[PDB]
Amino acid sequence: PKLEPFYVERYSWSQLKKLLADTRKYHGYMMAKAPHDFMFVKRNDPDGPHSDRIYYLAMSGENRENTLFYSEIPKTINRAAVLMLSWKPLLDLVGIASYDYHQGSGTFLFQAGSGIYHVKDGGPQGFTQQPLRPNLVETSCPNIRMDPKLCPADPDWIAFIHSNDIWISNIVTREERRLTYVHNELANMEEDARSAGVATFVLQEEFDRYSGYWWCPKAETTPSGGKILRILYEENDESEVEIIHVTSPMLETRRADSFRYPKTGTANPKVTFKMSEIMIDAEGRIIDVIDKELIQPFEILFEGVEYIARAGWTPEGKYAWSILLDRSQTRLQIVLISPELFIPVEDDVMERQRLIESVPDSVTPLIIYEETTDIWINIHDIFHVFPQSHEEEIEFIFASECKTGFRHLYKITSILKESKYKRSSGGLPAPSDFKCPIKEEIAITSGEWEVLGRHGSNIQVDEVRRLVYFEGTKDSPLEHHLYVVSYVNPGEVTRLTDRGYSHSCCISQHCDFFISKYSNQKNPHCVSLYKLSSPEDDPTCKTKEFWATILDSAGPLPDYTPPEIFSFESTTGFTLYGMLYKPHDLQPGKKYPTVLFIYGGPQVQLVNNRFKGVKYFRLNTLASLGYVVVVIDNRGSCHRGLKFEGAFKYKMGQIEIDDQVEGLQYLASRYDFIDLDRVGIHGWSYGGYLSLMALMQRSDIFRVAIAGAPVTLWIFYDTGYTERYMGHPDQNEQGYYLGSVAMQAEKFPSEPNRLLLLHGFLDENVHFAHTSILLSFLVRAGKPYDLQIYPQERHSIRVPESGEHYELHLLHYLQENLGSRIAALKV
Amino acid sequence: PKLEPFYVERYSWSQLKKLLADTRKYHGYMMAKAPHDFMFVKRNDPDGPHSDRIYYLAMSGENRENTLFYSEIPKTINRAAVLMLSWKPLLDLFVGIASYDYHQGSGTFLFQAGSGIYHVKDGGPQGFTQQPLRPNLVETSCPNIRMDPKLCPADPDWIAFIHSNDIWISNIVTREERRLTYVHNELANMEEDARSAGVATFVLQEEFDRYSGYWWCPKAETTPSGGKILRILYEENDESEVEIIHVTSPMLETRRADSFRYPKTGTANPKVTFKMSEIMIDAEGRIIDVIDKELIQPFEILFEGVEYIARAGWTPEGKYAWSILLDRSQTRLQIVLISPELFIPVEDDVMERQRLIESVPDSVTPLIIYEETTDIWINIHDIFHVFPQSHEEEIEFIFASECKTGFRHLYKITSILKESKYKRSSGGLPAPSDFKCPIKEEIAITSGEWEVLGRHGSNIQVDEVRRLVYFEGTKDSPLEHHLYVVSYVNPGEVTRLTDRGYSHSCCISQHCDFFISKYSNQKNPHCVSLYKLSSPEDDPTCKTKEFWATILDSAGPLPDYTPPEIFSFESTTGFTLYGMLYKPHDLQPGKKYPTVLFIYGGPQVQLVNNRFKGVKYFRLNTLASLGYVVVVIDNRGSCHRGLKFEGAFKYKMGQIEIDDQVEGLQYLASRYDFIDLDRVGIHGWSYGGYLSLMALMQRSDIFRVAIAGAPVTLWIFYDTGYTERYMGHPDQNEQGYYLGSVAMQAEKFPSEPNRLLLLHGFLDENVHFAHTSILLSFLVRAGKPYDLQIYPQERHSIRVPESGEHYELHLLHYLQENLGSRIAALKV
Ligand SMILES: *C(=O)C(CC)(CC)C(=O)Nc1cccc(CN2CCc3cc4c(cc3C2)OCO4)c1
Ligand SMILES: *C(=O)C(CC)(CC)C(=O)Nc1cccc(CN2CCc3cc4c(cc3C2)OCO4)c1
Ligand SMILES: CCC1(CC)C(=O)N(c2cccc(CN3CCc4cc5c(cc4C3)OCO5)c2)C1=O
Ligand SMILES: CCC1(CC)C(=O)N(c2cccc(CN3CCc4cc5c(cc4C3)OCO5)c2)C1=O
Ligand SMILES: [Cl-]
Ligand SMILES: [Cl-]
């Protein structure tokens, strides 16, 4: 019950710089983009030795660019040996982030730097044995072209965004044309605040939607012998959105860039759907372009809707679908929208009033699903629509947390009958006039575990065997695994991935292969191909066989000791998991200083069975200097269901440190080497927020707090995020005050060397103001602080030298104010 | 010999806060504006006991408003005793007055007090009040704040003021109000609407001390009808081509930035010109019409090469309007007379206007009555006196200049106003020298290795009866300002009127029979006294003074304030360099103490002189009480030592100043062994913060810690008026700008922490935060450590009390933890 304090070696600034540079020079080989965005194409060669060819994006090695590759999948393997697939470069010598494909032609389409290029492979053209030459799509457009997409109905056409307007371009006939005329590149953003086909700030940052336009997958054939291509697009008007200024990166100018930030409780962009009808003749040449708008306003047809979360088309191009949220993000709706709801844009009220009357009353919005929750809707990428058997019906799979409190798959069948509302009557539609009735709603899955549907996780639907492959947490919340089940008569759930690793998978479109990117705490990332088989007596049953390795793991790195995943039964009635790094060369009869690394906000899990030696390598480096490192997933973090996540609704900042302290005390009572008299805390963003709350609330536990890019004041943060978790400010005056660390400056320590603020000066999410206004109050209240600014940096640290300076200063600060001999001398 | 190191008392944050709060809570009497802006008015009462009444502005006591007071000057005194004048309040109150106007003939005061503009009467034909007067609000229909009020000297019923960057006039009797210029629109954006009238732009306020941009003509021209014509000369600026930068808005919740016009060095200054507002008033005192008038030819033609309008006004009879004009490089000054006949009505119609051009004769011309040049720089000042016109062909005036000898001295000049060789009807342009007047005479009223003072209130008073000129100067010592007097007709020897042992700040009665002096010295706080002037009967030129009364009595030696010792040393540069030394309180024998060099070191200031330093630099004493040696040195470049001494760093800022500081620092160490050179800190604000960074960067051997407040890290970001005066245009001094800019030399900073501290007001308009942020950006590239403090609700100066307390607290804790204390020496 005494123990001696260990003190870390007190290196100088120059020495720590060298220590970090030398330890960073070890790794870096494994800082390269692992194979992803896989696609399987069949050879169809009876005599040839390969069944499929697989295309994928990958970084060849370290400083080389991200580009298209391919490997060859054999019909049979040597089951004695282990087949390592070799990577064939698809392209001849600007990274590629994503690519499009068209099965019927073999056309690839992709952006590489400023250019948009295309090649052909695996179509009627056949299969290349040599790298292809990327063919530049020529243009007359002055500025950069973003968001290229192939037209699935016709692979000669592409679309793209230029200066916030939608353009199309033919890659054969070389024709180029502008579809929307909503933005003027010459005017100021104060005057011209409109755009088309592009998601606004909040939708990119807070809902992971980047594109804002969608090709209709089928072409209506014209009497003339040509066709009609279509593009559904969103049109945003940001005029009423507040304009803030953020410091321009060219610091010599002494100027600030304006941008549209919908801070909480203020106006989001004004949104609507539009349709671009494009009449092409028999020669593949544009006859006309008719821009079309909704027959009535968006606010009438889609009452209560703020956000267009997701959108697309049905497989046959009959309807266009959309997933719509209300402002509070407690009501989700899936709505079908017929192209017949759109009429041409017409100035003349005589011509226009006629066009309104030409559309039938039966043609209506069709809300094919609706759900509510008293916690919040979490948007995801799962949504699959089966072919239409009957005109009166539509059949689909969707996921939801709303029923059970865990995300599970549901097969739903809705009825498409005429609306009680009729347009000729000249009234407004009632709240429930467009609701379709639910004929059927089978639960495909259930339990105390979630189906995953974000960050690449999705489903794959086998419509022959009538199965659905999906990722989930059924076996453990610490490991993602691939599963498969019947969607017709949902029996039991067959796990397809091996335990002991967490997996990130995708399934061949043909449903006879899958790939898994897997790792665990001890073993780095690894990518392997697996073949799927049916026992002849029962096609529902699924077994897998290892076929080949795509990327082989590095194996245990020299000097990386991984942590131990622990857990504890909390007083809150929840198992809370954690990671523990023991100090290297652990001296008996001595107690070491502790660093708590934290995030603790929603939509993130720091603790799981994945390799932490690439991202969180410096947690290990801290352990090598003699610091105990702890990481805990408090209440509110993901993969534990909606109830666990909802613990802090309206109450951010109030519960998170209670969990972190409980787990910190669990470890102390068990392991006597943890010195509770010298505990530091450090995080970024929500972690920086919680680090400030820690020092403010619990100065008894935490000696030092190093706050990364703190949210000090929730009124300054955007609509999409802070309203989802904390509601509208007028409906939660208490929670905003208590959740805002800037309002509680007097509660900070009146002794120095305990508070360190870090911030990227040019930050667009967590504006520097959060820090500057906190400082303003700390200065009023006579409180001490230390400050580091990264002047050429936004939220993340992209410039190498800044990242080195962060690491150096952080390691020297912990040393001189927590770990070392001189630290305890100061008191 | 090595001696033992003294370590300062290692107090906690909370304890230092208490220590600082206790040491300033004791005083607070010292933060009160001493009597100033004096004016003597004669009683003219044979039977009455008082000769003059004096009006002045003062702060009654501690946290009270600055307001008008008066005292009574007796005809005789009891020479046995000392008379203390009592302060009679002029005003009823029922805010704060920075300045006032007066009209002798009527008794009319005029002054702004917060939002309002008021007026009272005392000491005219009305007579003299024995009770406080009620200030009479000047009523208005103008929605926004009215600034820069001025009485019309030709008619005290009329005033003028600026409202939303346009000139207005208002009658305080008839209650009429009217706008004269229509140059600005309050509703438009500053990006579009970049014009103004009657207001000095940024650079002229900050770098040339001109705040007003309009000037009443002192006389009215009588009309045939029976009314009159009042005139107002004004400058009109167009800031359209001036660069627009963004400074963070004080309302930090908005996340926004105010636009403002900053003439970055090398770039465009505002486009300027003169204008005249001709105002026809009838016999009733009511406006008939207002004709706005412009220069018959452009400013760039009539005043070739001129960038800045430094100063302007009128001659005493209102015949000519004068102006003092600089070129861009500020190496050529010109005094120019401008007749109202040079101005013509503003007319859209090209036919009507072309006729009006021809109506003005060719003989009517700009008249450059003086011109001078220098290869160092012109320093602008407020001295310029014009005598009445005896002859039509001549003009006679006093002016001061450093251009002849290299020290500022007075000169009586007589110039000839002959017609110009250039003639306007010819339709050509004028040559450079076509408007130069010949100099008939140029007598030197003073000379020597010392300067006449003409800035910050220092001026001259001209006795036109006895033909004398009173002035402030450094003749006796560069450490003491003194009042002197001399003949301007037959300039003999100068008679010092102030006592030695104090530095003085004086003004002289308009009637030249009294003067007042605000004086102090290193041991004694500030004191304001009245002195009577007398002639011997045999010789009016000779002047003697007699003490008459005290206006503000000194507080006497403060409790706990030990003042410093002024020292000096012969520099290797061939200059005497003066300094100030604070010894540690309770000086132990055989021990060596940590030293703090407090510095400014830039141009136009002198830190070392014989004045009381216990108000503003009180906390230098507080540093001495904790056991720090404190040093302050005036290196080359600082003022009151002539132009050559000041010129030392032309094109070379940053290169020479630390050599002088180190030399004096080593003089003191070789003399006093209690200075520990192993623990020397440096601290300054603005140019001081700049030099603090240079000190650490250049001489890391000498300076352990550098604490830089609002540093100029990069001279290309600073304004036209200042940096071009001292460093020239960037393209003509690529070497000096690079070497003078600390941000371009970040690699030369220490690679070891606890040595560099940056302090900055986040909302600073002069030295924009970018100086710091861009320096940091380079320090981060080069892997260098720094400590940073930001005062988010603060501009260049610290106005908010809490911010000032946090500066003092953090500064004291920093020096403690990284220089002075026990723990400090362990950290290395
Ligand atoms: C700081 O923590 C933060 C919020 C105060 C600043 C932006 C933040 O949330 N940062 C952050 C950084 C990296 C990754 C994430 C997680 N990500 C947030 C947005 C998001 C949006 C959608 C989603 C999942 C995420 C997760 O699924 C659908 O939309 C957060
Ligand atoms: C920092 O030192 C500084 C320059 C980098 C920032 C503004 C600066 O010069 N500061 C400063 C603060 C207080 C007082 C002065 C001196 N003052 C400057 C302007 C000036 C203008 C005229 C003058 C005398 C001065 C002196 O006489 C005529 O015009 C400077
Ligand atoms: C952005 C989202 C997310 C979680 C998905 C998150 O939040 N972070 C996040 C935040 C801060 C820091 C780091 C990496 N850090 C680990 C801590 C540390 C500690 C050191 C050091 C470097 C580093 C690097 O040098 C010395 O001591 C990662 C994420 O990613
Ligand atoms: C603005 C122009 C001028 C010269 C007329 C100048 O330049 N300054 C100027 C600059 C910096 C600081 C101070 C006052 N300081 C003195 C140093 C000091 C040192 C302390 C402390 C407070 C202070 C206050 O607390 C602890 O240790 C004054 C001028 O004014
Ligand atoms: Cl089906
Ligand atoms: Cl005379």
Catalytic residue of the set A486, A685, A691, A820: A685
Quote the strand ranges of A346-391, DSSP E: 366-372, 384-385
Distance from C-alpha of B195 to C-alpha of B182, rounded to nearest angstrom? 10
Among A270, A300, A297, A377, CA closest to A332: A377
Nearest CA to ligand 2 atom 26: B604
Nearest-5° angle of CA A215, CA A221, CA A223?
145
Question: Around B206, how many Cα atoms within 13 Å sit in the side-chain half-sphere?
Answer: 15
Q: Is A763 a catalytic residue?
A: yes
User: Residue A345's CB: how many other CB atoms inside 10 A?
Assistant: 12
The distance from CA B311 to its chain's CA centroid, rounded to whole angstroms, is 13
Quick check: B770 and A801 CB within 8 A?
Answer: no
User: After which residues does chain A break, using C–N > 2.5 Å?
Assistant: 93
Quick check: B780 and A790 CB within 8 A?
Answer: yes
With 0-12 / 13-18 / 19 or more C-beta atoms within 10 angstroms meaning exposed / middle / buried, residue A823 is: buried
Distance from C-alpha of A392 to C-alpha of B304, rounded to nearest angstrom? 88
Distance from C-alpha of A668 to C-alpha of A82, rounded to nearest angstrom? 46
Helix (H), strand (E) at residue A335: strand A331-337
Sorted by sequence, the CB contacts under 8 Å of residue B45 that are 6+ apart come out as none
Task: Find the B456 Cα to ligand 2 centroid distance in Å.
Answer: 11
Assign 3-state DSSP to chain B and report helix, strand, coil percentages, each to 5.
20, 35, 45
Residue type, B777: S
Helix (H), strand (E) at residue B825: helix B822-827
Q: Are strands B214-216 and B228-238 parallel, antiparallel or unpaired?
A: antiparallel
Q: Are strands B514-520 and B503-508 parallel, antiparallel or unpaired?
A: antiparallel
Quick check: B13 and A254 CB within 8 A?
Answer: no
Distance from C-alpha of B582 to C-alpha of A589, rounded to nearest angstrom? 53
User: Which residues in chain B touch residue A812, judged by CB atoms under 8 angstroms apart?
Assistant: 753, 785
Contact at 8 Å (CB) between B110 and B159? yes
Task: Find the A771 Cα to ligand 3 centroid distance in Å.
Answer: 19
- Quick one: tokens of A300? 């009438």
Nearest-5° angle of CA A160, CA A165, CA A171?
30
Cβ of residue B189 closer than 8 Å to a chain A Cβ: no
DSSP structure string for B101-145:
EEETTTTEEEEEETTEEEEEE-SBTTB--SSPBPPEE-----SSP
Contact at 8 Å (CB) between B213 and B235? yes
Contact at 8 Å (CB) between B484 and B476? no
Assess whether the C-beta atom of A19 lies below 6 angstroms from ligand 3: no
Resolution (A): 2.8
Distance from C-alpha of B772 to C-alpha of B780, rounded to nearest angstrom? 12
Assign 3-state DSSP to chain A and report helix, strand, coil percentages, each to 5.
20, 35, 45
Among B212, B238, B104, CA closest to B160: B212
Helix (H), strand (E) at residue A280: strand A270-280
Quick check: A251 and B785 CB within 8 A?
Answer: no
Among B68, B790, B146, B186, CA closest to A785: B790
User: Residue A44's CB: how many other CB atoms inside 10 A?
Assistant: 8
B261 pairs with which residues across the strands?
A: B244
SS3 of residue A492 by DSSP: coil
Instruction: Return the ligand 1 atom nearest residue A717 CA.
Output: 5
Quick check: A801 and B783 CB within 8 A?
Answer: yes
Among A767, A689, A759, CA closest to A725: A689
Residue type, B157: D
DSSP structure string for A575-638:
EEEEEEEPPSS--TTEEEEEEEEE--STT----SSS--TTTTHHHHHHHHHT-EEEEE--TT-S
With 0-12 / 13-18 / 19 or more C-beta atoms within 10 angstroms meaning exposed / middle / buried, residue A646 is: buried
* Experimental method reported for this structure: X-ray
A755 pairs with which residues across the strands?
A: A705
Residue type, A8: V
- Alpha helix segments (H runs only) across B614-685: 618-625, 642-647, 657-671
Catalytic residue of the set B277, B323, B686, B741: B686
Distance from C-alpha of A706 to C-alpha of A747, rounded to nearest angstrom? 17
Assess whether the C-beta atom of A766 lies below 6 angstroms from ligand 3: no
* Chains A & B: contacts with CB separation below 8 Å: 117
Q: Token match 């008008």: residue? A: B68
User: After which residues does chain B break, using C–N > 2.5 Å?
Assistant: 94
Q: Which residues have CB atoms below 5 A from the ion given as ligand 5?
A: A 386
B255, B716, B813 ranked by CB distance to A767: nearest = B255
A591 pairs with which residues across the strands?
A: A5
Dihedral pair phi/psi, residue A354, rounded to 5°? -65, -50
* Per-window interface: A 662-681 vs B, CB < 8 A: none
Residue type, B655: Q
CATH numeric code, B36-552: 2.140.10.30
The fold of A36-551 is Methanol Dehydrogenase; Chain A (2.140.10)
What is the 8-class DSSP label of residue B428?
-
Sorted by sequence, the CB contacts under 8 Å of residue A82 that are 6+ apart come out as A548, A549
Contact at 8 Å (CB) between B414 and B420? no
User: Which residues in chain A touch residue B262, judged by CB atoms under 8 angstroms apart?
Assistant: 254
SS3 of residue B156 by DSSP: coil
Distance from C-alpha of B197 to C-alpha of B182, rounded to nearest angstrom? 9
Quote the strand ranges of B153-202, DSSP E: 158-163, 166-171, 177-179, 195-197
Assess whether the C-beta atom of A762 lies below 6 angstroms from ligand 3: no
Contact at 8 Å (CB) between B482 and B473? yes
Q: Token match 């920075």: residue? A: B98
Quick check: A251 and B774 CB within 8 A?
Answer: yes
Sorted by sequence, the CB contacts under 8 Å of residue B793 that are 6+ apart come out as A776, A779, B250, B252, B762, B763, B800, B803
Task: Find the B617 Cα to ligand 4 centroid distance in Å.
Answer: 6
Among B177, B178, B182, CA closest to B165: B182
Cβ of residue B823 closer than 8 Å to a chain A Cβ: yes
Among A638, A652, A646, A643, CA closest to A726: A652
What is the 8-class DSSP label of residue A192?
-
Residue type, A544: K
The distance from CA B654 to its chain's CA centroid, rounded to whole angstroms, is 24
- Quick one: tokens of B690? 């700049």
Long-range own/partner contacts, residues B53-58 (CB < 8 A, 24 or more apart): B53/B123, B53/B128, B54/B516, B54/B530, B55/B90, B55/B102, B55/B109, B55/B122, B55/B123, B56/B551, B57/B33, B57/B97, B57/B98, B57/B99, B57/B100, B58/B33, B58/B34, B58/B87, B58/B552
Sorted by sequence, the CB contacts under 8 Å of residue A108 that are 6+ apart come out as A55, A68, A90, A99, A100, A101, A118, A119, A120, A121
Contact at 8 Å (CB) between B117 and B137? yes
Sorted by sequence, the CB contacts under 8 Å of residue A472 that are 6+ apart come out as A445, A449, A450, A451, A452, A480, A481, A483
Among A403, A373, A499, A508, CA closest to A54: A508
Contact at 8 Å (CB) between B293 and B360? no
Distance from C-alpha of A211 to C-alpha of A203, rounded to nearest angstrom? 10
Among A132, A130, A160, CA closest to A148: A160
Contact at 8 Å (CB) between A62 and A31? yes
Distance (Å) of CA A41 to CA A125, A152, A668: 13, 17, 55
Task: Find the B367 Cα to ligand 6 centroid distance in Å.
Answer: 21
User: Which residues in chain A touch residue B752, judged by CB atoms under 8 angstroms apart?
Assistant: 12-14
Distance from C-alpha of A342 to C-alpha of A345, rounded to nearest angstrom? 9
Cβ of residue A822 closer than 8 Å to a chain B Cβ: yes
Among B35, B53, B37, CA closest to B45: B53
b/e burial code for range A372-381 (CB count within 10 A of at least 16 → b): ebebbbbbbb
Contact at 8 Å (CB) between A380 and A454? yes
Instruction: Return the ligand 2 atom nearest residue B209 CA.
Output: 29
Sorted by sequence, the CB contacts under 8 Å of residue A699 that are 6+ apart come out as A749, A754
* Per-window interface: B 726-765 vs A, CB < 8 A: 751-753, 762
Instruction: Return the ligand 1 atom nearest residue A687 CA.
Output: 2
User: Which residues in chain A touch residue B246, judged by CB atoms under 8 angstroms apart?
Assistant: 245, 254-256
Distance from C-alpha of B264 to C-alpha of B158, rounded to nearest angstrom? 39
Assess whether the C-beta atom of A810 lies below 6 angstroms from ligand 3: yes
Q: In what order do the strands lie in the sheet with A467-476?
A: A459-462, A467-476, A479-486, A494-495
Contact at 8 Å (CB) between A405 and A640? no
For residue A202, give the ligand nearest its CA.
Answer: 1
Q: Is A281 a catalytic residue?
A: no
Contact at 8 Å (CB) between A291 and A345? yes
Sorted by sequence, the CB contacts under 8 Å of residue A551 that are 6+ apart come out as A34, A35, A58, A517, A525, A526, A527
Helix (H), strand (E) at residue A358: helix A349-358
Q: Report the sign of the C-alpha dihedral through residues B29, B33, B34, B39, in that order.
A: negative
Contact at 8 Å (CB) between A773 and A713? yes
Helix (H), strand (E) at residue B808: helix B801-815
Nearest-5° angle of CA A634, CA A635, CA A641?
125
A255, A752, A773 ranked by CB distance to B245: nearest = A255
- Quick one: tokens of B86? 């009592």
Distance from C-alpha of B620 to C-alpha of A789, rounded to nearest angstrom? 31
A344 pairs with which residues across the strands?
A: A292
Q: Is B659 a catalytic residue?
A: no
How close are the terminal C-alpha atoms of chain B, in Å? Answer: 23
User: Which residues in chain A touch residue B776, judged by CB atoms under 8 angstroms apart?
Assistant: 789, 791
Contact at 8 Å (CB) between A228 and A273? no
SS3 of residue B14 by DSSP: helix
Distance from C-alpha of A454 to C-alpha of A29, rounded to nearest angstrom? 28
Helix (H), strand (E) at residue B591: strand B591-598
User: Which residues in chain A touch residue B827, judged by CB atoms under 8 angstroms apart?
Assistant: 822
What is the 8-class DSSP label of residue A95?
-
Catalytic residue of the set B163, B796, B813, B821: B796
Contact at 8 Å (CB) between B494 and B446? yes
Distance from C-alpha of A308 to C-alpha of A236, rounded to nearest angstrom? 11
B255, B791, B792 ranked by CB distance to A244: nearest = B255
Residue of B nearest to A777 (CA): B792
Among A434, A567, A443, A460, CA closest to A513: A460
- Quick one: tokens of B273? 């010109």
Name the packing angle between helices A800-814 and A13-26 (round to 10°).
120
B716, B773, B803 ranked by CB distance to A251: nearest = B773
Q: How many residues does chain B have?
A: 828
- Quick one: tokens of B577? 């360099």
* Per-window interface: A 253-312 vs B, CB < 8 A: 253-256, 261
- Quick one: tokens of A578? 């954690």
A247, A773, A804 ranked by CB distance to B252: nearest = A773
Nearest-5° angle of CA A497, CA A502, CA A507?
50
